[PDB]
Amino acid sequence: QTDMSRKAFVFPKESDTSYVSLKAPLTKPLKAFTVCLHFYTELSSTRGYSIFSYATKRQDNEILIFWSKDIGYSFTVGGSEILFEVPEVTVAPVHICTSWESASGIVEFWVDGKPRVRKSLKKGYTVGAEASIILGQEQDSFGGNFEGSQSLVGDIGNVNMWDFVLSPDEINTIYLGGPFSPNVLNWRALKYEVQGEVFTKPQLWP
Amino acid sequence: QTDMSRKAFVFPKESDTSYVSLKAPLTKPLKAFTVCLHFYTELSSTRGYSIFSYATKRQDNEILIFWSKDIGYSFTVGGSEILFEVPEVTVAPVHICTSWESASGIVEFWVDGKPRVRKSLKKGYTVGAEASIILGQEQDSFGGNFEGSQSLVGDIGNVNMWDFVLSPDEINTIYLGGPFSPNVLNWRALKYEVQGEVFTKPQLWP
Amino acid sequence: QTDMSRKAFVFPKESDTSYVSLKAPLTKPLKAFTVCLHFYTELSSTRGYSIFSYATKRQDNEILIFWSKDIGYSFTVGGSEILFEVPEVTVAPVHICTSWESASGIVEFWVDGKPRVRKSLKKGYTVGAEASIILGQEQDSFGGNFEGSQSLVGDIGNVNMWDFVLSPDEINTIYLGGPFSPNVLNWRALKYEVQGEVFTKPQLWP
Amino acid sequence: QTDMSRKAFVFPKESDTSYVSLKAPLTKPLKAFTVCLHFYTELSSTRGYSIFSYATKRQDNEILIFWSKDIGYSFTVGGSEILFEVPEVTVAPVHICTSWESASGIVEFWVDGKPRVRKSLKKGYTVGAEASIILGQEQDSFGGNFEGSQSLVGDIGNVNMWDFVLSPDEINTIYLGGPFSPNVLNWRALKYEVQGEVFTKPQLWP
Amino acid sequence: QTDMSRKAFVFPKESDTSYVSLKAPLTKPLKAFTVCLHFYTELSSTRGYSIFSYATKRQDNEILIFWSKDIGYSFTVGGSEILFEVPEVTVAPVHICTSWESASGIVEFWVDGKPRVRKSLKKGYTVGAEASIILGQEQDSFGGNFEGSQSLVGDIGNVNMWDFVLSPDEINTIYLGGPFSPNVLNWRALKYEVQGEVFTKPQLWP
Ligand SMILES: CCCCN(CCCC)CCCP(=O)(O)O
Ligand SMILES: CCCCN(CCCC)CCCP(=O)(O)O
Ligand SMILES: CCCCN(CCCC)CCCP(=O)(O)O
Ligand SMILES: CCCCN(CCCC)CCCP(=O)(O)O
Ligand SMILES: CCCCN(CCCC)CCCP(=O)(O)O
Ligand SMILES: [Ca+2]
Ligand SMILES: [Ca+2]
Ligand SMILES: [Ca+2]
Ligand SMILES: [Ca+2]
Ligand SMILES: [Ca+2]
Ligand SMILES: [Ca+2]
Ligand SMILES: [Ca+2]
Ligand SMILES: [Ca+2]
Ligand SMILES: [Ca+2]
Ligand SMILES: [Ca+2]
């Protein structure tokens, strides 16, 4: 357990061996979830990068948040991809929240507290519980097989994960700075593991 | 009767068989009306879509609100079309109010509480009372014959219908969030019928 | 006498025979004046139109306010024209005030409470008193000879006329909505005459 | 002495013989000064014009503020010119303050209370005391030889001149409209002389 | 010791021999530092210029802050360069803070109180203590060998240097004018040496 309030992981330069591993107390498979986080990078105009890699032994992309240059945000659960197009890209810290529900397949994508339209993806699916969560790298296998061209170079922090779907009002308090209690991943109670060239410094965003 | 406050219909993906059917207790033909609603979609840059389809046995487009790509808003009553051009299109939730009067033919179109100029359309017409109201699809016949390329993909809600013309001051309270009583269709007392892949989730707009 | 507060004239569709005739209790010829009004139309990008036509038996353009497409506002007194160029045109309600002085020829043109530079026009002239004032059409003769391509299609209201020149401080209150006592044309005590396809509905602007 | 508060000089139309002559009680030559004023004109997109002409028997451009079309602001003291480039030109009232110091050659140029970078001009010079100050025309000789193509057409006022350099804090109060005491030219105690077609009317700016 | 509060150095015109030399009480080599300053110039659109030149006998570019036209900000420590690209350049006063850490190589770059992403540079380096600090010129040798095309023409002031890395909260107060205490270079206690055509005048920014 570590209180990571006001701190953030920083990946200074592109690398093949830098990443942090988040550990989750999972026991039941997920029928829905919600992931929120902050990050800041200039790469969005040069190439793409991995933002949040959640892998399983049977599926290297169990749930992945990815930025594809010139296209926008890429959101894939269970190997199937959906896109949230973004034309104008301005370099600044950004806050994303994204949720998925099995019973309906609806996926919500919030960017800086403002919601994007709702789309479908993997209706009826069930996400694996025994996962490997990695920041700063894209997983091709369980916790391994990283591509350096998918590295994240910059700051990442404030990651929080639930096992249900957050309502608009809850998403607002999360972005606005209100008190929320995650039940999967908690920034204020993080069990993590550092590997490679990564540092912990005060966060740049408010 | 269903109180749909803070809830909205969501059509996740393009489809040919998804729609909700609103039921109206009409007895006299309409000599004027006013229709208001919220909706949110990214389609406006890809194609056009149906926003509100009100059909009669003799006229498949008794009153229709439609978005034509690259042109703007399309408003047709009794088969006759009038346009409200829109050059710049920004993706976000939008609130539309539109009214029509027979004695004058004047049509008003409000977008996010700001009015567009007044135009003429079907002066002296009389709208049919035995209608079929459909959301998420365009009607070519009484409650049927849907085109998939006219589907609405996204959120729609807060639909309310009167049988007279609302004054500017009245429209304001509806947009600003005040307490009003619709007299044709009431979001707070909706008799509807769901069909296909459609869901009811908390609304995204305030 | 009619109190026209909060009401406005609407010319829904293009026509050749629609207009209202304002009646003025004039006795002395005008050595200066000031005219203010609201209007709202989309025509500004399609063609030109007449906003306020003040005609005399000897001069069909005794004082005329006109929008010439691609050029801007046209202001002519006694047959002589002056232009206030406008490059960017955005469709929305607009408030114009315009004054003329004989002793100096100075003309002011205020748009939405913001003034344009001062220009000269017909120094020493004297405007006729026995006039015909028409809204929605352009006069080629005393109260007649309308051209349909000069029609005004939209809303017009809040027209008020003085027989002297209004100061900046006064113009401000008129735009902001303060109490003024006109002595030629008074919206709150209007003697007018309707003709053709014209209607009276609540005003759209605040 | 005349208090010209809230009133302004207006040059309605282009002319060769319209101008006002400001009279200054000078006795010592100027080793530094500061000039502030308001003005409003549409010419900036058509041609250039003279804003403030201070001439001597030996030097027709002892200190001149000039707008050169497509280039920006032109500032010349003692016959030597320096430029403050301006790319985008928007038509509205503008407030300029400009100062010069001999010991350093530093010139400051403030536009609407915001400063431009500092530049050099005529270090060690000494400005003549027996000058002719003219508004609305450009001087080629002592109080004469006007070029009509250099006329200023519009409003000008609030001109005030010191014999020292105003600090940033002081410039702010001058722009905001606070109590300042000029010791060369004072709007509230102006000894001037009108000639030609020029008028005194209330100012358009606040 | 000199208190330079509210004052700033001015380099009026391009020159080869104008510069101020800041003197620092250094004894130990720097394992990290942070530099903050204000500056204002129009050159950014014409050519590049030196902002802050810190040279050693063995390295003419021990730490240099430089603006390269059409590219953005150039930041080099120990001869190795890293870039913070800037596409749009608007002329106005600007406040920059920049820090470097040896243990991590992380460099932060704050512009007008807003941070750019974190990058790596010269991890494990050690900056020399016996340095020559120059403003307004670029050093090719210890305190000499200036290129005129690298001159800074405009205002510079409020320069402050620490020997550690400032946190986001500290950078904020420094931008706003907080009670910060530098321990290398202090604007409120500057031991400097002036040379050439440079002047000390009140600062232009707030
Ligand atoms: C199987 C879906 C792959 C999603 N994909 C996004 C493509 C946008 C650039 C990331 C590639 C993951 P990978 O490196 O393991 O192959
Ligand atoms: C008869 C008027 C048709 C109006 N129309 C708008 C055209 C703008 C793209 C929608 C088409 C209705 P439809 O699918 O039944 O033919
Ligand atoms: C005699 C001056 C005419 C002014 N004119 C403005 C031209 C800009 C399009 C309106 C035409 C008046 P008209 O219809 O009676 O001839
Ligand atoms: C001798 C310097 C002349 C400065 N000059 C500015 C040129 C920018 C268009 C105004 C011309 C003064 P002039 O009319 O007496 O010749
Ligand atoms: C050795 C690195 C040089 C950095 N450089 C920035 C280049 C961007 C225009 C300034 C040149 C220093 P110099 O004048 O001594 O050669
Ligand atoms: Ca993968
Ligand atoms: Ca990979
Ligand atoms: Ca149809
Ligand atoms: Ca259809
Ligand atoms: Ca006509
Ligand atoms: Ca005429
Ligand atoms: Ca001259
Ligand atoms: Ca001349
Ligand atoms: Ca160098
Ligand atoms: Ca050099």
Author numbering:
A (entry chain D), B (entry chain C), C (entry chain B), D (entry chain A), E (entry chain E): 1 to 206
Provide the publication's sentences verbatim.
C‐reactive protein (CRP) is an evolutionarily highly conserved, acute phase protein that is synthesized in the liver under the regulation of the cytokine interleukin 6 (IL6) and circulates as a disc‐shaped homo‐pentamer (pCRP) (Zeller et al, 2022). We recently identified a novel mechanism that leads to a conformational change from the native, functionally relatively inert, pentameric CRP (pCRP) structure to a pentameric CRP intermediate (pCRP*) and ultimately to the monomeric CRP (mCRP) form, both exhibiting highly pro‐inflammatory effects. This transition in the inflammatory profile of CRP is mediated by binding of pCRP to activated/damaged cell membranes via exposed phosphocholine lipid head groups. The PC, PS, and PE head groups are known to bind to a shallow groove containing two calcium cations located on one face of the monomeric subunit of pCRP; hence, there are five PC/PE binding pockets on the same face of the CRP pentamer (i.e., the B‐face).
As proof‐of‐concept we present the data for a tool compound C10M, (3‐(dibutylamino)propyl)phosphonic acid, a monovalent CRP inhibitor with a molecular weight of just 250 Da. The asymmetric unit consisted of four CRP pentamers with the A‐faces stacked against each other. The location of the C10M molecules confirmed that the tool compound binds to the PC/PE binding pocket, with the phosphonate moiety being the main mediator of the interaction with pCRP via the calcium cations. Residues Asn 61 and Gln 150 are in hydrogen bonding distance of oxygen atoms of the C10M phosphonate moiety, as observed in the PC:pCRP complex. In contrast to the positively charged quaternary amine of PC, which interacts with Glu 81 via a salt bridge, the tertiary amine of C10M appears to form hydrogen bonds with Glu 81. The n‐butyl amine substituents of C10M make numerous hydrophobic contacts with pCRP residues (a full list of putative interacting pCRP residues is given in Table EV1). The C10M:pCRP complex retains the pentameric shape of circulating pCRP and, apart from the occupied PC/PE binding pocket, the remainder of the B‐face is available for partner proteins to interact. The A‐face of the C10M:pCRP complex is unhindered, hence proteins which usually interact with the A‐face of circulating pCRP should be unaffected by the bound C10M.
